[model samples]
Target: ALRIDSHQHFWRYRAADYPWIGAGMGVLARDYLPDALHPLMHAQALGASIAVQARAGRDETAFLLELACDEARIAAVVGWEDLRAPQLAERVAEWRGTKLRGFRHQLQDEADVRAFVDDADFARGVAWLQANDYVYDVLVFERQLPDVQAFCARHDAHWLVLDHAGKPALAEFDTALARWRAALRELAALPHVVCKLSGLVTEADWRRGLRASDLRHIEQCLDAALDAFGPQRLMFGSDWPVCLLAASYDEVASLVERWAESRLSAAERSALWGGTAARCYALP
Candidate 1:
């Protein structure tokens, strides 16, 4: 099987640049460059990983691409772009043959998440992405699932990925979990949209402790994702540095590995580990 980490991050954290990193997230306030992650990736036998953007700026994208240029194991990068800008098409054109694989916006932080995507001008930018063979990663909370569904439906032909399995609140199983499952199913119905089994640990109730033993809700969420996306439309992601607040790289990777081992056949597991990501991002 091709062992690939579909999502993770490499950041030179600056408080001014990432104001969203509140005091509660102090653990992630330091730099997390490729040097720190390469050892971990090698220790676990990972062939390559996709470096995702932590900040919302074209400069951050360029910074990540610079690291990708120097790091052999960082296979591709998912950077941020001003998707709503008038020069959206031209900006994408600028990154032509670089390690740039896709772009993402922090929609979960927006007050009117749906309204942002619903904008005609924003939809125009998305259309340009589709016309250019680029992918978009949807980062949002469970409450934003309905909005995300509508957004994905609009760009149903574009390659879209839902980061963190929509960032479900496992503690609120009845109301929140039920809503997430329904919304995920709706989004997965669109053939071009896929979901990542990442970031669940951070969404979980950390008071219980960070070990894999606290996995009842996390496993349940993964079970729901497998049911909705199947193995082919699903992929593994560490959501690193952020995941450090909950579990180690080994723990996060093993959580997915252990769950898939029991539920998926070898071939299906291979797709979740790497094949799906390579296909989704068109990675070389």
Candidate 2:
């Protein structure tokens, strides 16, 4: 079977538009389109990939949709839709037939990380997605897991995917790992809320200065995640150009490949690489 990358991204970089890329944006200041990704996909033997939105706008959503339309290898897209848009119903209705499998807000960047559960307007927007049968990719910091837990508890599980294993704090890893694990297990206990094993490299390796080594941190996270969600609820993602912050596409891909090979059965590997994504995204 052809392996699937459940999460990744493509962007036409414009510094003015991407303040979120932050201080060390030098390495990612150029365009990373399908042309850049297809070769990497070929090298990894990835048959298809999911293109997620980097910018938060209707324009960014449209950009990814067009790319997914023109590129056969981009199997699906997770776009940025303003769940809080006044005409959100009309917007969701308009986007019904495209490759957009879900919506993502940079909740990690949100000033109020608990707004998903705390604010009515934001929560109502997500309610619209649930009503219309769309997915809401929850992106939040580890500290915000409590709100995530509260928000997710009120909704159905199938539509929620916890991106990057809640993006644990690898810089202060030794002190943070236990709390992250405990919180992650709490999320897992919700039942059927899937997690992605993506973005591990950048979180651990991007600035390993003196805080921690990449290998040990990544290994412990994998162990915690595998123990928490197992291969059944876990899925693979390169996180692509964002992954370039710490490691190349091949290095991250091979890292997960090595972990899976030693830890999983062929059946479980199948689920992690492709099956979970197809089912969760309801891909054709």
Candidate 3:
């Protein structure tokens, strides 16, 4: 089968002002680039990656765009954008010339969970993305799950990709699971939204390495995502460099492949591995 890791990240650890990477995250204290990731993906028989933004600026997004333009290894990019910016369309218009596939905001870092993207300004930005035929990547934690559901309901035609299964209750298993599941189902009602089965290990137990028990939790999460989005809409991402805090790029990618192979059919695996993302990102 084909191999494509549709969700990983690349950044110079020293350059990036990643406040989240401090004290708590034990291992991801360095750069993660094509060089660092190529070996691991190659070892696992993976071919390319859709590198997402781990940094906070538009410059980072542009950097990835340039990288994808230069290197075929980076199949696509879910780059960053200033969501509230009025000139986002024009910015995206220029980026469209490159391999700029999708846009994302660090909503997980933002405050005010309820009215996150419901405000007029942000909604206008989202509408601009829809107008340009660009995908809006919704990166949210459990607190923003309901907000994401509400957002998807209001903007039905706007294409969206939900990252990390709305970041299910990695810590608070019972309450988190209940709330996350309900929110996911509600969000899944929107036909335009796709969910990536990514980012479980690092988020699960950051201090230590990945555990088999956490795999069960992640498997359950995967089931919910596949059931909601189906194999066609589901995409596999390593959540690399960040996941390297808990596991290697190969480890994360292999886990998704293993589970997907058993749970989904051959065509389904193709979609998860690359088809969904290639179409979603409009990759060459």
Count clashes in each candidate, considering only residues at least 3 apart in sequence or on different chains: 0, 0, 0
lDDT of each: 0.85, 0.82, 0.78
What is the overall TM-score of model 2 with all chains considered together?
0.94
Please give the distance, in angstroms, between residue 176's alpha carbon in candidate 3 and its true position after superposition.
Answer: 2.9
| TM-score (all chains, Cα) for each model | 0.95, 0.94, 0.92
Model 1: how far residue 237 lies from native, Å? 0.3
Could you give candidate 3's per-residue lDDT for residues 138-199 as a string of tens digits? 88888778766677777666579888778887755527777788888888878888888888
Please give, for residues 1-284, the per-residue lDDT of candidate 1 as tens digits. Answer: 56788889877877898787776677889999888888888877899999998888898888888888866688889998888889887777777446798888899999999899999888988888887777899999998899867889889766999999998887555277788888888888888999898898988765555544458678888999999888899899999888888788998998888999999999998899898998988877
- Writing each residue's lDDT as its tens digit, candidate 2 over 1-284 gives 44788888888888889987778657788888888988998998888998888888988888888888867698888888777767888876666445888888888887777764667777788888777667878788888898778888776734788999888888667469988999999988877588999988777646543233666688788879999987788889998888888888898888888888989999998988888888888777
* Clashing pairs in model 1, backbone N/Cα/C closer than 3 A: none
Indicate which candidate wins on TM-score: 1
